[model samples]
Target chain A: DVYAQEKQDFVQHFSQIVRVLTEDEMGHPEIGDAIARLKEVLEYNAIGGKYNRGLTVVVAFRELVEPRKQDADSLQRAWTVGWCVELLQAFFLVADDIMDSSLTRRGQICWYQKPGVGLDAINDANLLEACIYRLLKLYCREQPYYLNLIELFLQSSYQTEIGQTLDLLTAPQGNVDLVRFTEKRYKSIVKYKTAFYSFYLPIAAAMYMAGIDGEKEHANAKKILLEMGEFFQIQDDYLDLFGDPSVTGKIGTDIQDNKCSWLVVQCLQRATPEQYQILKENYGQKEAEKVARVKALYEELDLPAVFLQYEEDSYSHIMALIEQYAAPLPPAVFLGLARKIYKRR
Target chain B: DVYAQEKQDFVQHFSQIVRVLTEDEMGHPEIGDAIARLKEVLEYNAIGGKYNRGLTVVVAFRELVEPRKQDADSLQRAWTVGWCVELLQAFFLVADDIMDSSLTRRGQICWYQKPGVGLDAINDANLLEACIYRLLKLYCREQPYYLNLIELFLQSSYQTEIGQTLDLLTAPQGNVDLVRFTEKRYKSIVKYKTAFYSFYLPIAAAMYMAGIDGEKEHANAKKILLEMGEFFQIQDDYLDLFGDPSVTGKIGTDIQDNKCSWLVVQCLQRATPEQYQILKENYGQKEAEKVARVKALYEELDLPAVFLQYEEDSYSHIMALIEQYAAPLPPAVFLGLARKIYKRR
Candidate 1:
């Protein structure tokens, strides 16, 4: 209930960001139109996400910063930083959709896929990336932790890009090579691509804002949060084949798209020679029959049961990590994140 | 001559950047390959530029910072920042080439056009961007001007992306409307798209490194540098249509690509009814005859002579600004830049 309440307020703060960015160009002829298009970009990509990563910033800030220091101004900065994370997501997603030739996002046509947009989405994606810094300048320029936040976001971006580089190389579109789908490679992809920004960046931002940026503390938080990140992405991979399309709002194409999904990786690991042959034949093809065959192989291998067990074990492992590592601040920050993951979508 | 010498060293410094980025991943299983690909992206895109923008940082740092402060260490940081500018250019160019559907850059195939790179250049461009901050953190983390440099690069990126947005809207590919080619819109596009990062960013970076970040000084520098930027781009527009392709190392495509070139804008202003009709029919076409007609239109309007006069006037204007406002800082910094733009390709 509190998260729902805070999320409503968090989503509303986007208007202030738009106003600060757009208002100064009021008299300009050309810049105003660019700002208008930027507004469309922000609205279309940044606002529609589940707000999970962004909310993590606000919630963690509330738990870590002292109650006396948790004034309206500090909280507002927290919310803004959270939105920056969302903007980062939008930036990556817009670009990622274009790279993946994706058609829709959040129940609407992807920005790049829209008529008249095409490759121009590349620049729009860049504008989204630029907005993160603009928002930082507007909201956090005076903060003591300004450089810390900037470095955090930039480092996360590099890590994510490195991860994306690996993802593309490993599971290049339209090419199936089970040989590249090792668990070692899969974990690396998940950590760099999905983990750092999705899991570590938001909470670490809160920690920096809360003045808890000791090397040991950040190392400990990264250790725990990255595990949570891995679990989250694994769950996503699980849901691709197993989730209700109605609930997820999109159909799974990992099988057809030749993705480096966790299911495929595990399928490769557990498969016998004949099973591997089935996957080698059925994986990465666009046909419904081929996709169904891959699904059949996954069911026969009982990947659902394996995922359920991995989910439980990962939750416990993360709990133990929080118990061992989360200290002097509060376990609730990690616990809040862990609970959100294990509990629901 | 000294510019040539400094440029040799400036170009050599890229290896250190590559080492810093790639060496740490020596033990990395997947990251190493990504690092290798990143090295390819950097070498392909970052190295082949004329080194004007990157060299501006080093030269301006040498002129502005006190001799004692401009020690080996500070110069190295200056060089690193300079490379960061190149990386920024690389980031934009790789993405811009993709957006523009370009075939080649620097006499070779565009990175996106290279076999197997395709849309994946999107992420490579991002990695190039991430490299800027990585190089910044590597060299400038301890400098008092660290945050200043970070914000400088980030702000420059935003300004350039805004310019790109304006350019894309002003000259959408495959759609020609001369009504959109007014001087006002053209200047806005040039200033935003090419001027800020190319001209002001490098010099401002050096000023910041030299601890000359006063608001007044930066404003003055921006005024001079942005004017030079406009002139540089206008010259590029001129060269596109009129300059020797063998000397420039690339053929011009502004006419066929439906670009918002300065010559076209000027032609629109100078056109009579028949001339306007000729342009309306011939501009933005792909055929050799149509392109030749547009070239003839440019010649009929005497754009080459107009460009020579504008280049002279811009040099005078910039010199005036430097004399008027480049106080408490040597005029050599700005003059050095002015000399480079007017001299040659």
Candidate 2:
């Protein structure tokens, strides 16, 4: 029920901030027409994603504050903060598409590939980041955590870019050599590259804004959320290998792309000498049957069963940590998040 | 003499800011590499091209401020503000090279066309804009006009881009019509596209930062600077027609490129029926002789003489206005700027 309320609040707050800055006189007639074209890109790319990372702020906020007594204004403020998280996601996605040389996103042509939009998409990404600041200034200017939020967002972006640089340098186009895919290395990539923004940033921002500044609280929150993020990513890796492409709306190409997905890396780690040789031969090959061969090996190795057990263990681990360290905080919020993600098909 | 000192001081201040922020580890390594490449572009594209527009800020600052024995710090602050004017010029040039699909700039490969930098140059442009803010925040944070400078820079960039949008739409490759080359249209393009930032923005920023907030002073400054910007652009147009490519380091292709240059538009406005027919047939054609024929006709019409007379008239008009409206201000600054432009070959 709280998650549903937070989703509605996010839509409302995001639309409101967008409405305030909708100026007719901003762009040229031709570029103005392109601006309209860009609106479609923004809408499809932004709306109806999994919405989990953005929603984490509200869920975390609900846990930190008193629940039943919390007024609508407090909830609205939390949702507005959550919407900034979504904007940050949009900013990264816009730039990432360009970096990846991606042709489509969310089943639509990527903005960079759009006619007359070759490189201007980069500027559009900066504009998206600027919009986050504009929304923050509009809603949170007088808040004590205003500067703190700005610094945190900038620092997080820098960290993520560093991780991205390393990824680009190491495993670009997803060449999956076991030599390049150590578990230790993969964990570092995911933690700095994905977990920081996806798991920790939004929650940390909301906690700071809510006047919860204890170091222990932040550390506990990070530990739980990062484990959740790793679990979520592993599920994603499994889904890429075995899930229906029609259902996901994305044809899986992680193996061919040389992505250091958990399934491939784990398979490599657990494999005997013979299986490792098969992986090396077929991992980053472009042939369809080679990819199918790799996926079959993942099946033979029972990665799906491994994922099932891992998911269950991760869920229990997070719940136990919530009980131990989520003291002086509402347990329902963490419980609700766990219920949503655990055993999600 | 004072204006000369101000110009020297401004360039020095800007160089220092550039040195501090553009060092290793601050900007992206690739982006920083691109910036270093663009430093060569700046040296060739920006330097030695008559720093008139850049110098206008220093001259205007002198005329706007009361005569006083200012300290070295105060003078340095004024000069740093002047350097902002030059930095803006550098920013636009780097991005404009990409927008125009230019192959070479200042006798070197355009930054966008450099190896390993196809579309990433767009991000490099955004980085340039960000550097302006970084420099401003570093050197001028305590100043009262810091926010004003930031706002002015943003607004000016938006306006200039709007002008660019119009220019690109109207004169997209190989689609020039002399009918679209009206004097009124040309003036609008020049004012919005070239005048505001080059002429008005720097001086206005310096004036505001120096605590001169009177409406009349700003209006007078706008009138003078806009006219100067217009005149300066016209000289650039004339030089493109008659100036030596060896000396200018760029071959003139405005006739073929269908640029909204001053010469062709003015010739259209002043051409008789026979000359108009010739222009209609030859303008924007790819043939070297056709472009040469149009240039010959422009010469026959005494465009060079006309340009010289127009230069003299515009200089007199600005000087007369400066004499009438410039109050509690020095005359040397405006006089020096006028001398620089009118006397430049």
Candidate 3:
């Protein structure tokens, strides 16, 4: 509830970003329809996320920036940067939906799956990425940390892209090779693909804006945050198979999708030859029976109990990281993220 | 001919960029295969282009930078920036190939069309895009113009994306409407999609490197270069219908693709009611006869002759612009771009 107002305000500011990008082109003869489509894209794809990543920018800024420096103008800039992270996520999701051949996102049909959209969604995804920089220039061009913000976003993107590359190569569709889905590979994929942008990017943006972008402070924050990110993603992998669909709002497809999920990697490590044979026979199949067999094998390996142990160890490990690294900056920044992820759903 | 050596050197430097991004990660446990694929992506997509856009940075920098500052380091930076433009183009082309369902590029199968690489090309396209920033940071991190270069690429991408959106909306695939193929719509698409990044970005990058980022200078350069870009795209549309495939190395699909091309806009303007009906029926069809019929219609309208007249006017207009605006900076920068586009193929 502490971030409720900030989340609400962040959602409301979406209208201003849309207006600045679209309203100025109203008088053009031909760009009207394009801008209209852009409006729909912004409305459809960039909204509806939980706003946790976007809010991290504001929350971190409030914690890190001095009250005197956090004037109304600076706070507005912080919110805009927060939305930029959301934009980055939107861009990645739009493209990822296409790559993964996903059908729905945020409880609706995927953008590429809309009638008459198809591959045009690629350009739409690109447009979403372009909006991040446009918003940055609109709000933070004169800020002293402008270049740092730009470079940070760029690096986050590259790291995530590399992570995606590793993910695809490690767990290519229709190829069932448990050999490739090791614990090391899983962590690397999660760190590069999910952790940097989702965990480190927002806080770093706020730090840059708050003028605390020293190498040592960022290295410390990143050490703690990436650990949190890894822990968060492992939980995601665990929940994909074991969590309640009624509560998580989605059914697990890690088996059918042949994903390099945490449960699969753990199962791989613990499987006997007989259990590995069952996994190879039934994994990555579309049939319900085949998927159920893989799920049975995971249960046979008692991956749920193994995951509980790992979760406990991970929580303790991250708490140690926060204790050791969350110095000179409030530990609440790390604490809040840890609390949000250790959820039942 | 004059740019041949520079083009070769620019391409050779790509290997160094690849080494910096991938080789440094070799010590990692899980990144070996992903790095290998990245190398293949760089080789397959980023190389084999004409390198004109890449070479533009070097040419313009040589023309603009004084002899005193034209040290080896600065020239290498120029070539690196030149290659950055090429990488940007590669990123767009790889993605565009997928969106357009293109079969081949530069005499090879489209990356998306490769076996086992269906929608996965989307992420590969993204990786190609991230490489530009990586290359920029590796080569130009300490340069005072670093942020300007980053902003330049970001703005160019946004403008090109807006252009792509306008283009798709104006001439959506599988829909044939002559009313929407107006010259105004065509130019808007060309200016946004083709002109700015292809024409303005390279020279503006050079100007920044030369420490000449005056708003007035950039506006003037953009004015002249965008006009040249418009002219260049119109020439492209012209050649798509009339040029020899033997010389051009590829056949044209503009007619079959339902593109908003220069020939179609001109044909629509000149058509009688009966002729308009022919285009409405025969344009955008996949059959050979339908394509031939559209070509016959274009010839009947004498678009080839019309294109020559437009070409001459465009050249004279660009020359005038160079004379009027390219002061204190050498006119060679603009003149060289003008000369390259007024070719038969």
Candidate 4:
């Protein structure tokens, strides 16, 4: 209930950030309609996300610092950092949707896929990334943690780009190669692409804002949070195939897209040679029958049962990680995130 | 001549920078062939530029600092900053080429146009940009100028992106709006899009490296440098239209592409109402006759002779600037740049 309450506030506060940032460019006639375009970009790509990644910054900040000390300025800072994380996500998703040729995001047409908004989304996506710094300079220029936060976002971006580079190589669109779907490669992709910014960055941001910048402390937090991220993406990959499309809000296309998905990597390992041949034939094709065939092979492997076993083991491993590593701050920061994942179906 | 000699050394050192930065990711399997991809991106996009933008950093650093006291590390820093400028250009050029649908750059097919590259050049451009920070972190992390340099690069990137946003809006592909091509609009687009990074960043980088951090000094350098950049781009626009494609090494497309160029803006100012109608019809069309008509319209407005008068005026104005603001740092720092653009056919 508190999370829902805060998210409503976040969405409202976020529009003002967009407004103030773009408003700085007012009276510039060089860009005839750039203000309207920026408004559309902000609303269309940014505000609609679940806000989970953004919320964790504020929530984790609350847990890490003197919670009683929270006030107007502190809350504004937390929300701003949270939006920075969200901007990073929007930046990537815009470009990713174009790269993947996706039609929709968050139940609306993807920004790139909209009429008159094609590849121009590339620069629009870049402008989103550039906003992270602009917002940083605008809001946090005087903070002691300024450079730390800048480097934090920069590191997150480089790591995410590396992850994207690897993912593109591993599962290039229009090509199917099962060899690229190893369990090892899958972990790397999720760790870099999905894990770092999602799990670690929000918490790391909180830690930095809380004045906790020790190299070891961050390593310990990253170790635990990245594992949480690792599992979150694994769960995401699992749900893509087996979960309800109605619940997910979008149909899964990993099978047809030939993603370096955790499910596919596991399928590759457990598959016999004949099973492998079936996967090779059925994976990455656009046809419904081919996608259904791949689903059939996944079911025959009793992957639902395998998923249950993996979840149990992963939960236990995460709990042990929490017991050992989630200290020096509160356990609640990691525990709050871990709880979101445990039995998350 | 001495400048030419060291620029050769600068080019030789850049490849070493590329190799060392990518050495960290050498063992990754998910990034199948990333090294090869990086090498191609560095060579294909970064190396071919005239290097004047980058060389300004090196030359200005030399002039601003005590040349006799310069060490290998100092020289290395200068050269590295030069490449940072180049990398920034590469990042923009790669994406700009794609956005503009340009076929050739520096006498070769655009990197995006190269077989097997496609729009994947997006990430490659990002990596080139990322390398600037990586190289900075690797080389200058210990220097007091570290944060200055980081902020400088970040500010330049944001300013450049804003400029690009303005440029894109002012010249949307396949649209012809002469209303957007005002002289004031042209200045805004060039100042933001090209001048800040290309002109001010390099010299300011040197000034910072030489321990010159006064706000007044940077502002003065910026004023002089940005004016030079303004003239440089206006000259560039002139050359794009009237200069030999053989001399410039690329054909111009501003007419067909509907760029918010200085010549076009000036032509709009000079054209009669009937002449404006000719432009309204002929501008931004791909047909040879239409493009030729736009060119003829430029000639009818005597844009070529107008360019010569503007050139003489910009040269005298820069000389006055060198006398006034180029003091605290030797006039040669500004004069060197002025010479390159003055009477440069």
- CAPRI-style grade of the A/B interface in model 2: incorrect
Best by DockQ: 1
Against the true structure, candidate 2 reaches a TM-score of: 0.72
Docking class of 3: high
The TM-score each candidate achieves on chain A is 0.97, 0.87, 0.97, 0.96
Q: Cα deviation in Å at residue A24, candidate 1?
A: 3.2
Decide which is better by TM-score, 3 or 4.
3
lDDT by residue for model 3 (B1-345), tens: 557757777777777777787774757747777778888888888888788998889988988998898999998889888888988888899999998889998889998999988888898888888888987898899999888899999999888888889888887777777788888888889988889989999999999999998999999999999999998888888878798888877788888888888998999999999999999998888899999998999899989899899888888898899999998788888877777877555
| Candidate 1 lDDT, B57-175, residue by residue in tens | 88888888878777788888989999999899999999999998888888789999998899999999999999889888889998888889899999989989999998888888767
Give the per-residue lDDT of model 2 (tens digit) for A54-85: 77788877777767646776676677778777
Instruction: Name the runs in model 1 displaced over 4 angstroms.
Output: A27-29
Clashing pairs in 2: A173-A257, A174-A257, A174-A258, A174-A259, A175-A258, B10-B79
Tell me the tens digit of each residue's lDDT in model 4 across A1-345. Answer: 446768877887887788777776566655545656776788888877789999999888888889676878888889999999999999989988877778888778889888777778888888888888888888888999998999999889888888887787877767788887778778888888889999999999999999999998999999998888988888888899899988777688888777888888888889999999999998888999999999998899988899889889999998898888877778888887887777554
Point out the worst 10-residue segment of candidate 1 chain B by lDDT.
B24-33
Error of 2 at B160 (Å): 3.6
Reference-based lDDT, each prediction: 0.88, 0.69, 0.87, 0.85
Flag clash pairs in model 4. Answer: none
* CA lDDT, candidate 4, residue B65: 90
Two-way lDDT contest, 1 vs 4, winner: 1
